[PDB]
C-alpha cells in the first residue's frame, strides 16, 4: 500500500543561472542534459529524482519541453534587450538555423522544446559530441536579469538504457 507519489506531472526545476558578472553573455546547452560549465555566471542544479535517473543509468534518450522564468533587477521602465534561444543542427560552424526565438525581457516568460539524443538514438553522461540538434541561450543585456530559471517536463516518450551507479 504505497502512499502518494512525491511529484505530480507538473514541471520540475532543471537549472538556474544567476549572478551575471559580464554582459552580452551566452550559455551553451546543446543536446546534453547537464555539464554546462558557464564561466561568466554561476549555475545551480536540481536534486530531483529524475536527474538522478539520468546519473544512474548509462544511456538516456528523449525529448523534454522547457519554460523560461526570469525577473528584473533594474527598473522595468529602464528595461531593454532580449533573451533569445538559438536552435541549430550541428554546431554553429555549420548549421541549418532551425526554429529560434527572440523574447524581449519585458515579456518575462517563454516556453520551448529540446531534444536530448543523437542520430545514434541516445546520449551518455561522460561527454562526447555526436551530430544532433544544438540549443544555446544568448542574453543581449545580461545585468538586467537578476535570476533566471528553466524548468523542464519530459514528454511521455522517454527512455533509459543500461543500469549503473554513480559514485559522485
Amino acid at each position, epitope marked *: 500500500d504505497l502512499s502518494l507519489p512525491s511529484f505530480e506531472d507538473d514541471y520540475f526545476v532543471w537549472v538556474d543561472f544567476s549572478e551575471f558578472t559580464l554582459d552580452k553573455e551566452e550559455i551553451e546547452i546543446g543536446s546534453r542534459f547537464f555539464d*554546462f*560549465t558557464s564561466n561568466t555566471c554561476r549555475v545551480s*542544479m536540481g536534486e530531483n529524482p529524475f*536527474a538522478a535517473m539520468i*546519473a544512474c543509468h548509462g544511456l538516456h534518450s528523449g525529448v523534454l519541453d522547457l519554460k523560461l522564468q526570469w525577473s528584473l533587477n533594474t527598473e522595468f521602465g529602464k528595461s531593454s534587450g532580449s533573451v533569445t534561444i538559438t536552435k541549430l543542427v550541428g554546431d554553429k560552424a555549420m548549421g541549418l538555423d532551425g526554429p529560434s526565438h527572440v523574447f524581449a525581457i519585458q515579456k518575462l516568460e517563454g516556453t520551448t522544446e529540446l531534444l536530448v539524443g543523437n542520430f545514434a538514438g541516445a546520449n551518455p553522461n561522460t561527454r562526447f559530441s555526436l551530430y544532433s540538434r544544438w540549443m544555446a541561450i544568448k542574453l543581449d543585456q545580461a545585468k538586467s536579469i537578476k535570476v533566471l530559471r528553466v524548468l523542464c517536463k519530459p514528454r511521455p516518450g522517454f527512455s533509459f538504457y543500461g543500469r549503473t551507479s554513480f559514485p*559522485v
Partner: nanobody
Amino acid sequence: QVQLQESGGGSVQVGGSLRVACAASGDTFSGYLAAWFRQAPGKGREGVAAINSKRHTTSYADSVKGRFTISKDNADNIMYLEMNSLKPEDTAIYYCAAADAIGLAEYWSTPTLSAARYKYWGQGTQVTVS
C-alpha cells in the same frame, strides 16, 4: 579526518604575488571541495575562490577576477591558493576550509561560496600590506 597546516603570508609591495602553502592532507583522501575565505574588521566571512577539483571546474569570488587564482598541481595533487597580483586591501587572515559531503546538486553546479556549508575550519595564514 582532516588536518590543515599553512604558512606563506607576509607584507609585500603592490603588484606582488604570494603563494600559499599546499593544504596538508589528512586521513588519506584530500579530495574534498574546499574554498578559501576572507574577513574584514567588523565584517565576517566573505568568500573567495574555490575549485571543484575532480571535474576541473573553477569558481571565483565577486569583486575579484584574475588577481586571485586557484589551481591544483597534477603531480602534487594538493590544492593551494595562488595570488599573482594584489590590491592594497587584503586585510584579513585567509582561511582554508573544506566540505566532503558533496552530493549530486553540488557536483555539476558551480562551487558554492556560502560559509555555512563547510564543516572543517582552521586558523589559516596572516597576510597584509603596508
